[PDB]
Amino acid sequence: GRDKPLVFFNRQPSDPLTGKVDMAAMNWNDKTYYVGFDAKFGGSIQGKMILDFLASSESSVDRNGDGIIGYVLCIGDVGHNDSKVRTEGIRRALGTWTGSSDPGQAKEGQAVVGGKSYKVVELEGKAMTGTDGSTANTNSATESMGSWVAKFADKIDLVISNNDGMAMGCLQASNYPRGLPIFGYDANADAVESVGKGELTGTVSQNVDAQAVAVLQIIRNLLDGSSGEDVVANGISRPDAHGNKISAPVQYWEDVKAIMADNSEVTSANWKEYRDAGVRQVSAPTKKVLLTVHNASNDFLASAYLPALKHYAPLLNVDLTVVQGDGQNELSCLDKFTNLDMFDAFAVNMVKTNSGADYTDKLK
Ligand SMILES: OC[C@H]1O[C@@H](O)[C@H](O)[C@@H](O)[C@@H]1O
Ligand SMILES: [Ca+2]
């Protein structure tokens, strides 16, 4: 029970307001870990991508020619540290950062367009909450983009979004101005193709494939009887006995027990570039893993993360039982987190980042 591996992933145990890491949950046992990505670095990368685009642009990106680069921001999960730090990244990059990641918290910024200085204004930063309470709702993004165009019109010079889902949702707007620069995050399949079409201007890969392998590989190492650095290194930062290794670069953060993949920008200049050859068939005995997903209709998890898991799982001889919640209530997941005695290891993607206790309670 409490002696088995527990790997949190994609939603780090943490306080949804202050973002401080929940080390109580992380210190569940000596076989507990988190797998994710360097979210803060990812945030600055999204910002840098936007600054580089503006820098290479002519003064035509200033549509109304008022000398101000106006933008609208799609805020996602305000209880998710990885999401908010993207709002922080782009705001810092553009000079609109005031210390808060909340909607309506922005000052006048500054950026270079065609070797000239420009004022920057966040016309509106809004949380795209669905009428059913669902966060980062894509239909709400379409709705908001429609109103924004009607309200601000020629003032909007670009669109920014915490993820691809909402960004691709903006593009659904019937009145979306042809060619309006817009940026997302995740490098979902549809988003990358959109970059190739010259619609979506750019997005960011968080190396989801590296993350998926890392979850399985850590469990693999632990069930093979590894301890210490071997657990977080073998098949991850160095080759294991089988010879397998995650190709993308990965860091281990000891203080928070986290394996973090890095990020890379995706633009018109490199979209064609976007499975791991460094992972091939394992001979180790098969093991049973119960893996949860906080929301079955989550675009990133449904379209990118889960397929990755189901691809690499048999290669590492991990028989994966997948259960999925609704994104609203932790009970939608916790209800399916049962028969824990019939499993060798566990992977948890929580609805709320502060719900660590509820999962470790069941494992007693
Ligand atoms: O937890 C779900 C979230 O994970 C993040 O890594 C993605 O950027 C979001 O698009 C997604 O909604
Ligand atoms: Ca303008």
The span from the CA of 218 to the CA of 298, in Å, is 24
Resolution (A): 2.1
Same domain (yes/no): 284, 342:
yes
Atom of ligand 1 nearest to the CA of 206: 6
Element housing 72 (H / E): strand 68-75
Closest ligand to C-alpha of residue 71 is 2
Here the CATH number for the domain that contains residue 110 is 3.40.50.2300
Q: Using the mean position of ligand 1's atoms as its centre, give its distance from the Cα of residue 314 in Å.
A: 24
Are the beta carbons of 54 and 279 closer than 8 angstroms?
no
Q: Using the mean position of ligand 2's atoms as its centre, give its distance from the Cα of residue 77 in Å.
A: 28
Same domain (yes/no): 123, 53:
yes
Same domain (yes/no): 50, 117:
yes
Same domain (yes/no): 218, 351:
yes
The DSSP code sequence of 227-268 is -THHHHHBTTTB--SS----SS-EEEEGGGTEEEE--EEEET
The span from the CA of 294 to the CA of 303, in Å, is 14
Q: How many CB atoms lie within 10 A of CB 252?
A: 17
Closest ligand to C-alpha of residue 153 is 2
User: Cβ neighbours of residue 162 under 8 Å, at least 6 residues apart?
Assistant: 74, 75, 76, 77, 83, 86, 87, 136, 185
The span from the CA of 183 to the CA of 121, in Å, is 16
Same domain (yes/no): 146, 65:
yes
Closest ligand to C-alpha of residue 158 is 2
CA atoms within 13 Å, Cβ hemisphere of 95: 14
Q: How many domains does the chain have?
A: 2
Same domain (yes/no): 258, 323:
yes
Same domain (yes/no): 104, 171:
yes
The span from the CA of 148 to the CA of 154, in Å, is 10
Instruction: State the residue range of the domain holding 164.
Output: 38-205+263-274
Query: What sign does the CA torsion over 302, 298, 164, 359 have?
Result: negative
Q: Using the mean position of ligand 1's atoms as its centre, give its distance from the Cα of residue 300 in Å.
A: 6
Q: How many CB atoms lie within 10 A of CB 285?
A: 8
The tokens 């990020």 sit on which residue? 263
Of the three residues 274, 306, 325, the one that is the final residue of a domain is 274
The span from the CA of 122 to the CA of 345, in Å, is 46
Are the beta carbons of 159 and 170 closer than 8 angstroms?
yes
Atom of ligand 1 nearest to the CA of 300: 10
Q: Using the mean position of ligand 2's atoms as its centre, give its distance from the Cα of residue 123 in Å.
A: 11
Same domain (yes/no): 224, 356:
yes
Specify the amino acid at residue 236: I
What's the chain's length in residues?
364
Same domain (yes/no): 96, 213:
no
Query: For 348, phi and psi rounded to 5 degrees?
Result: -125, 125
Query: For 129, phi and psi rounded to 5 degrees?
Result: -80, 135
Tokens of 54: 């503006």
Same domain (yes/no): 63, 82:
yes
Q: Using the mean position of ligand 2's atoms as its centre, give its distance from the Cα of residue 95 in Å.
A: 16
Ligand 1 pocket, Cβ-based, cut-off 6 angstroms: 10-11, 82, 136, 163, 165, 185-186, 206, 298, 300-301
User: Cβ neighbours of residue 227 under 8 Å, at least 6 residues apart?
Assistant: none
Are the beta carbons of 196 and 294 closer than 8 angstroms?
no
Of the three residues 234, 250, 274, the one that is the final residue of a domain is 274
Same domain (yes/no): 170, 256:
no
